């Protein structure tokens, strides 16, 4: 069945499970060519991103189809729709799989032969297969007990030279470190409470942020039961996972519980099997973003302030109305012990499969899948205004510029219901004729996906701390939503074989979709793959295996739901930092929806051509695999930006080609292999070339994916890679000299934003090593990704706050920007003269806050890194020690994940593996003070009975 | 107002250091064309009732006027066509000012006597007062043409025919229907007192003029300094300079008079205040008739309208009979000076867009000959009430702001959007 005409990679469960990760796919980061796998954050329960051969979908569905046995597994993401003010990520549908349950994962990277799975297989397939019952000794019980810690990996590198102040001057209530160079002298700080004030030495506390963090801790327990006969098998498993992350208190929390029971029974020509699985989850997120969020509050701390001294709330100076600074942040310990962001989900999925063999060469199969989920979010904020405003500095002493305005409390709750059903009807025919071999299978596929939720919210909490829809004197806000889409299709997959040497397969599939215009819902897509193992019938025996493959094929695709017709929404108006919605005042109103529909759309069509080679030498002691692919995604249906003066802000239409060409390359070999010792190396390499080819130019050939209003924005532009950033840049004279304001000394903005990079790695590769010696196992895996940029609010804040090491630049003495001029303009004769205006000490703060000489583009940070991804020390106890014991096998295990990261010198701020805008395309925009990545290490005990 | 010293949300508005890519208008452009003007197009497609069409046309015209007074050119005649023209050409402000004035005319003449059968939160189906809203906009635009010296002769006789008919609106043209809860407040309040923290402090021109005139209105919207209990304005774009000169500790919010948000939670949104209406007639009388007695009548109608709205009815005496009184003004220009300055006060905390545009048309308040740094060094040089070019000024040509950038959304998706000019180039009707 490796008559496959395109690249794929197979991983056995033993390697998936061995990293002891809560999730199936994050242990695979950097180990498979062409499979880009990254976590959104180190926050427990976060989503994972998986993107195969680059982005094709401009918004925003690039995850591979996960097919578990083999039924489409639902893999929807639950993350915050506003990552600037309240970023949270609650998880990814594939996370529910118990990794201990996996037998083999095959990842199919090719979109040439997709008739089996349909449209969603164009982003690739993750073909999981779960363990089955087996005969063995003795009782069939496997136990896995885990324990693990996490610590913070990379904090921003801080200046330790200047303490609390602004404009270079000493203040007692600043959120920033633009004060004087440290003396060691006795200064005042913080508010004054009851006619007394805190007075401490004016020295730096280099570890103040480092010591705020705890060690995360995580226990896990997995149990399985299996048995078989010669007619049946049964497998039943339980897994539990309890995570409390490094952020102090229980606010990083993830609890996972899974239960699963699968069985088969053959009777004659008939086999029936079923697999039914239940998954539970409770996440608690420490919300990120620019307001009274924890980390924003934490980064805006003077370098002389002890953070762990701020925790005791019986010290009145830490009480919220006397907290030392009032500048739009709060005590992080108060935010963590008093704000609620909670998620809970129960989920049931399973399949029924009936196989019936007849007439010697035919097999009928019916397979039904059902995936259903209910989730409940609960978010609350205390009503800070009525709790602390009158009587306090922070407080009515700050008036309209208080952090309690209008923090009047909020509480909401959402309940979400998802349910996918998939039905497969297949008859397969398979007969050898001479040395030839014919495999023919035709099938029907029905699919139905539905999601709905209801949402309700109250503001202005009467009793300030109680989060309950009853606790407000003001109107509630309610929302409800429902989507339903359906697909049917027939498909056929003919596979010819000659003498285990020449494999040639052709596919063909025509779908009908609800989400396309009625006049055009049928789309057809064929595909041809071939395979030829030339070492079979080439002597020696030095070429263990030699395979060459080719594929040419199309997959179709429909749109997202409800994009054909004009809608009227209930009239609302998005205004800076707020809305003005109807009803007013008693009247309700409907506005024409701001996205223009289209009844002329055609199906999406993805075309791909791929060649590849696979050779092995010296009894599989040296192997390589290489693939060359050329994928274009055409006519993709997208809500494309349009000039609002047309009447709409976007129009649904078919785009042009998004192209990904690239090379995937995998080389492994075992230099050393004796009886007791083996050493294997593995090197995989990927280089993908992203190019948008055309965006319908009648609307311009640019469209926003994600961006701040008048700030750094990521785009799709006609001739360029997906995800190019535009950012503000300094003006420059014809000679490359930086133009500077003749009075203040600070750089002048250019007319336009500058194109300042794309989101794409230029290349990404991994290097791995495995050593076995007498049942001792040692694995080391390195992940390398180089190229691309990413917005980093982590930097932006430590520049603005004056805590980054870069801001200690001219040792903060007034300075002229090197190589600076002034633009002298008299009506229309522009002339540049040498600048003699310095940045004053009082304005140094603003030179850095706006980004120095880069201006905004400074906060585009190089995405590159090398990571020591995972290390796994494993010890299979010698079987003789297990003799007067009930144990068949014991293996103790020590592992670390995400252990160390190296980055270019231009990035001393973040682990590039962060986001705030999800696990798909918009996540590449950057990180909006995501919580800092963690380093995880643990033990695992495996006991077989 | 200016930027409060201890926050930062509007540094670039204050120092004119914004650019086209700062999108300082992109939200408003969106909700004006893809919201207001599209719904108007559909209303026009769905009803055949003249009075509804009439009041709809007036709100459509009002939206075009706003855009034109921001960017001179605006889409029009080719806008609101969806996929038939996703890139509408930008008509010159003059072609749309004549256009929308033609539309109001055609719609008024279409009236038949039948009532409005539509929810009207401006006038509650009072056809008479939509008529007055439409004449008030004619007055407003007729005078734009005259001071732009474009067909001034005829628009001069129409503006006089308009004012002697006196067929204007009573009370104020406002959307008063906000509540102090959530997504239902005054937009400005919501954005600047709920969404953001306090960013606004009083500007120096306003505070020096109100305190010079001995005006009690100075307590409405403006609070005393917490440091000392006085009224202190900040010189335009001078936040960073006062901190440089006085030290960080002696130019905090404590030292400058804050804009008071508490009156704004449910405050209406004004399209045409009555004080402004009278001040425009007081101008037409004083300047195209020669009817001092009537000009003075409409001038005092203006001061006492605005005095009642802010809750100071009975106290217009303090600027009407106090010094800056219609008679301590000998030249006819000193009296037009009086009208424009009291129009300027009456528009604070009411209709700021219209204040700026009338500042551009009459160029009164004048621009001070003295720079921010000089005014700060010895205040005696400054005559209270005239504008001050920002201390740091991102306009290569200095002076005051004359127009707003084109929307970045229009720039990126409409090939025909006029090339970005600097904020110093005037709109088509500001000719001095």
């Amino acid at each position: 069945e490796k008559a496959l005409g395109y690249a794929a990679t197979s991983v056995g469960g033993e390697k998936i499970a061995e990293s002891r990760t809560s999730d199936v796919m994050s242990s695979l980061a950097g180990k498979i060519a062409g499979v880009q796998i990254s976590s959104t954050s180190s926050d427990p329960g976060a989503s994972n991103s998986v993107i195969i051969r680059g982005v094709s979908s401009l918004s925003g569905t690039n995850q591979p189809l996960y097919v578990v046995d083999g039924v489409p597994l639902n893999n929807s993401t639950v993350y915050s729709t506003d990552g600037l003010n309240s970023g949270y990520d609650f998880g990814n549908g594939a996370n529910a799989i118990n990794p201990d349950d996996v037998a083999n994962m095959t990842i199919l990277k090719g979109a040439a032969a997709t008739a089996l799975y349909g449209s969603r297989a164009a982003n690739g397939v993750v073909m999981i297969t779960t363990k089955s019952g087996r005969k063995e000794k003795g009782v069939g019980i496997e136990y896995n007990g885990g324990v693990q810690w996490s610590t913070v990996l990379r904090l921003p590198e801080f200046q330790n030279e200047f303490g609390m102040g602004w404009n270079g001057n000493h203040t007692e209530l600043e959120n920033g470190s633009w004060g004087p160079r440290f003396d060691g002298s006795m200064q005042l700080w913080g508010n004054v409470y009851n006619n007394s004030q805190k007075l401490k030495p004016y020295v730096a506390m280099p570890d103040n942020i480092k010591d705020f963090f705890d060690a995360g801790f995580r226990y896990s327990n997995s149990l399985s039961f299996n048995g078989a006969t010669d007619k049946s098998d049964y497998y039943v498993s339980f897994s539990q996972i309890s995570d409390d992350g490094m952020i102090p208190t229980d606010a990083d929390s993830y609890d996972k519980y899974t239960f699963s029971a699968r069985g088969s029974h053959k009777a004659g020509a008939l086999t029936f099997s079923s697999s039914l699985n239940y998954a539970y989850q409770k996440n608690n997120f420490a919300t990120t973003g620019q307001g009274l969020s924890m980390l924003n509050s934490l980064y805006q701390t003077p370098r002389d302030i002890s953070i762990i001294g701020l925790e005791d709330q019986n010290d009145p100076f830490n009480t919220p109305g006397y907290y030392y600074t009032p500048y739009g942040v709060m005590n992080p310990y108060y935010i963590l012990n008093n704000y609620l962001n909670e998620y809970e989900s129960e989920r049931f999925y399973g399949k029924f499969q009936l196989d019936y063999e007849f007439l010697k060469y035919f097999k009928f199969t019916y397979r039904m899948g059902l995936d259903t989920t209910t989730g409940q979010s609960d978010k609350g904020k205390p009503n800070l205004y009525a709790l602390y405003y009158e009587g306090t500095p922070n407080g009515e002493g700050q008036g309209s510029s208080s952090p309690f305005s209008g923090e009047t409390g909020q509480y909401s709750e959402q309940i979400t219901r998802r349910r996918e059903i998939n039905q497969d009807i297949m008859v397969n025919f398979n007969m050898p004729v001479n040395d030839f071999n014919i495999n023919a299978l035709v099938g029907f596929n029905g699919n139905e996906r539905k999601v709905s939720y209801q949402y309700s919210e109250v503001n202005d909490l009467t009793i300030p701390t109680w989060f309950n829809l009853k606790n407000s004197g003001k109107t509630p806000i309610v929302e409800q939503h429902m989507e339903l889409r359906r697909l049917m299709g027939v498909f056929g997959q003919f596979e010819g074989s000659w003498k285990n040497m020449l494999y040639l397969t052709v596919t063909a599939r025509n779908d009908w979709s609800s989400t396309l215009p009625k006049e055009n819902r049928s789309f057809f897509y064929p595909g041809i793959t071939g395979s030829f193992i030339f070492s079979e019938l080439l002597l020696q025996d030095v070429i263990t295996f030699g395979k060459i493959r080719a594929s040419w094929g199309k997959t179709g695709n429909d749109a997202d739901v409800y994009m054909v017709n004009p809608v009227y929404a209930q009239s609302s108006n998005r205004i800076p930092f707020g809305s003005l919605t109807f009803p007013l005042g008693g009247v309700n109103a409907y506005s024409a929806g701001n996205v223009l529909g289209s009844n002329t759309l055609s199906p999406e069509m993805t075309t791909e051509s791929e060649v590849g080679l696979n050779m092995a030498f010296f009894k599989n002691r040296l192997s390589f695999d290489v693939s060359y692919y050329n994928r274009n995604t055409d006519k993709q249906i997208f809500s494309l930006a349009m000039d609002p003066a047309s009447g709409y802000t976007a129009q649904n239409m078919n785009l042009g080609k998004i192209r990904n060409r690239g090379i995937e390359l995998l080389i492994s070999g075992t230099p050393i292999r004796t009886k007791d010792f083996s050493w294997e190396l593995t090197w995989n390499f990927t280089k993908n070339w992203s190019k948008v080819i055309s965006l319908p130019e009648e609307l311009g050939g640019i469209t926003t994916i994600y961006g701040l209003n008048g700030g750094t924005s990521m785009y799709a532009i006609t001739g360029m890679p997906v995800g190019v950033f535009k950012a503000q840049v300094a003006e420059r004279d014809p000679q490359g000299r930086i133009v500077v304001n003749s009075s203040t000394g600070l750089p002048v903005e250019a007319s336009e934003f500058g194109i300042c990079g794309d989101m794409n790695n230029k290349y990404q590769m991994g290097v791995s090593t495995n050593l076995k010696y007498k049942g001792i196992s040692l694995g080391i895996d390195f992940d390398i990704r180089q190229g691309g940029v990413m917005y980093s609010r982590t930097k932006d804040i430590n520049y603005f706050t004056g805590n980054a090491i870069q801001t200690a630049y001219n040792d903060r003495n007034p300075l002229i920007v090197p190589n600076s001029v002034n633009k002298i303009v008299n009506g229309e004769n522009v002339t540049y003269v040498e600048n003699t205006t310095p940045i004053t000490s009082s304005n140094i703060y603003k030179y850095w806050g706006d980004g120095g000489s880069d201006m905004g583009s400074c906060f585009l940070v190089d995405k590159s890194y090398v990571k020591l991804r995972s290390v796994v020390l494993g010890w299979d106890l010698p079987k003789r020690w297990l003799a007067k014991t009930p144990f068949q096998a014991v293996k103790v295990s020590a592992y670390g994940n995400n252990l160390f990261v190296w980055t270019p010198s231009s990035n001393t701020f973040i682990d590039p593996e962060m986001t705030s805008f999800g696990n798909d395309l918009e996540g590449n925009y950057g990180e909006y003070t995501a919580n800092p990545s963690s380093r995880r290490f643990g033990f695992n005990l495996m006991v077989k009975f | 107002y200016e930027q409060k010293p201890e926050s930062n949300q509007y540094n670039t508005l204050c120092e004119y250091t914004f650019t086209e890519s700062s999108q300082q208008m992109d939200y408003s452009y969106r909700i004006l064309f893809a919201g207001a003007l599209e719904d108007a197009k559909q209303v026009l497609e769905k009803t055949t009732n003249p009075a509804d069409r009439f009041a709809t046309t007036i709100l459509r015209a009002y939206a075009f006027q706003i855009m034109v007074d921001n960017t001179s050119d605006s889409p029009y005649s080719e806008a609101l066509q969806g996929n038939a023209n996703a890139t509408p050409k930008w008509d010159t402000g003059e072609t749309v000012y004549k256009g929308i004035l033609g539309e109001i005319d055609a719609a008024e003449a279409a009236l038949d006597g039948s009532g409005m059968d539509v929810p009207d939160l401006i006038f509650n189906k009072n056809i008479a007062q939509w008529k007055g809203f439409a004449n008030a906009l004619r007055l407003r635009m007729y005078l734009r043409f005259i001071d732009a010296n474009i067909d001034a002769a005829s628009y001069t006789e129409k503006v006089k025919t308009l004012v002697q008919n006196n067929e204007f609106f009573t009370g104020d043209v406002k959307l008063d229907c906000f509540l102090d809860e959530t997504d239902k407040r005054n937009p400005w309040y919501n954005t600047n007192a709920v969404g953001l923290t306090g960013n606004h402090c009083a500007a120096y021109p306003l505070v020096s003029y109100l305190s010079s005139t001995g005006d009690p209105r100075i307590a409405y919207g403006i609070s005393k300094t917490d440091a000392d209990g006085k009224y202190v304005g900040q010189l335009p774009g001078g936040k960073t300079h006062m901190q440089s000169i006085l030290g960080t500790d002696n130019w905090k919010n404590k030292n400058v008079s804050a804009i008071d948000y508490s009156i704004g939670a449910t405050k209406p949104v004004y399209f045409f205040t009555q004080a402004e209406l009278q001040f425009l007639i007081a101008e037409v009388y004083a300047r195209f008739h020669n009817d001092d007695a009537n000009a003075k009548s409409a001038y005092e109608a203006g001061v006492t309208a605005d005095f009642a709205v802010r809750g100071f009815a009975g106290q217009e005496n303090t600027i009407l009979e106090g010094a800056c009184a219609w008679s301590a003004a000998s030249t006819q220009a000193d009296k037009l000076n009086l009208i424009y300055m009291q129009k300027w006060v009456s528009l604070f905390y009411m209709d700021h867009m219209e204040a700026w545009s009338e500042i551009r048309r009459t160029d009164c308040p004048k621009l001070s000959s003295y720079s921010a740094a000089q005014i700060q060094a010895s205040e005696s040089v400054y005559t209270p009430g005239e504008l001050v070019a920002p201390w740091t000024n991102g306009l290569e040509a200095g002076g005051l702001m004359k127009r707003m950038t084109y929307p970045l959304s229009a720039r990126q998706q409409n090939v025909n959007t006029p090339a970005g000019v600097p904020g110093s180039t005037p709109v088509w009707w500001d000719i001095k």
Binding site: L84, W166, Y327, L708, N709 | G195
Partner: peptide, 10 residues
């Protein structure tokens, strides 16, 4: 773009 963003305090 879309989505606001506030300056800090100092």
């Amino acid at each position: 773009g879309g989505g606001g963003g506030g300056g800090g305090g100092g």
